[PDB]
Each structure stands twice: as structure tokens, then as C-alpha cells.
Amino acid sequence: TMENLSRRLKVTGDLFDIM
Amino acid sequence: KSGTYWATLITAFLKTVSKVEELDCVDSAVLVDVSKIITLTQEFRRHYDSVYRADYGPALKNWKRDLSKLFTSLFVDVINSGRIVGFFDVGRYVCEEVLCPGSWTEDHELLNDCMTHFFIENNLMNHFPLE
């Protein structure tokens, strides 16, 4: 689903500013 | 910066990742930012692959009709640099994996407009300091 990808991208984006 | 500058930057970025043979002259500032964005999206993808096994492929098979839903949902609760980079990475993916590299088609223009409108509408340049 496009919705799952959306959660994964948000998780990655949030952890991106960090890690 | 200028809304026109960002519209110009987005198109330039998409054409570059699409490997468009014809070089549409842009300021050095624009190219520099295109370079920075490509590098960021690759770092971003690197993190995505470390955390998840899945590719963007499956979910982006209906991009021409759901990409907008994806962008709204990507910034539904907040906006930060990381999500914006993911935003461009989704674009790089479409140009590199879905669409064919080397030509700038109507589908590209569809992608370009979708990204350009959402970026500007949502004031993304305000949360995306290329320093």
C-alpha cells in the first residue's frame, strides 16, 4: 500500500535527521 | 528562496536523475543544489534499506494516481528536512526505476508538476535549508 510506504518514509525521514 | 527558483530547481533535479541528454541551462546555484539533493536522497535510501527490506516499487505502481496522496500523508503531522529528502528520493526512484532514463516524457511532466505544486503549496522551502 502507498500508506505503508508513507509510514516507512516518515520513519526514515525522522531517523534521517538523527542517524 | 524564490518560488520560481524552487520550481526551476525541481525540474532540473528531475531531468538530471532522468538522465535527460538535452542540457537545459540553469544557474550554477541551481546545479549545486541539484547535486546536494541527489547526494542526500542516496544517503536517505541507504537508511531506508537498513531498516526495511521492501522497495518503493510495489506502492508506486499507481503513482500517476496516488503520488499526491503519498505526499500529503508524508507531511500530515509535521515537516522536517528528512521527510523532504524522502520526498525527492521518491522522485528520484520514479525517474530511475519506473520511468525510462534518457527521455523527458509527459509522465515526467506529470511527476514534475505534482512535486512542484505540493512543494510550493506546503511551503517546503521553509523547512529545507540546503545551508
Residue numbers in the entry:
A (entry chain C): 106 to 124
B (entry chain A): 5 to 135
Give verbatim lines from the article:
The BCL-2 family proteins, which are commonly known as positive or negative regulators of apoptosis, are characterized as containing up to four conserved stretches of amino acids, known as BCL-2 homology (BH) domains. The interactions between such proapoptotic BCL-2 family members and the antiapoptotic members, such as BCL-2 and BCL-XL, are the crucial events in controlling or promoting apoptosis. These interactions are mediated by the BH3 domain of the proapoptotic members that binds to a site known as the BH3-binding groove in the antiapoptotic members. In addition to their critical roles in the regulation of apoptosis, the BCL-2 family proteins have emerged as regulators of autophagy, a catabolic process that plays crucial roles in cell survival, tumor suppression, and innate immune defense against intracellular pathogens by degrading cytoplasmic components through lysosomal pathway.
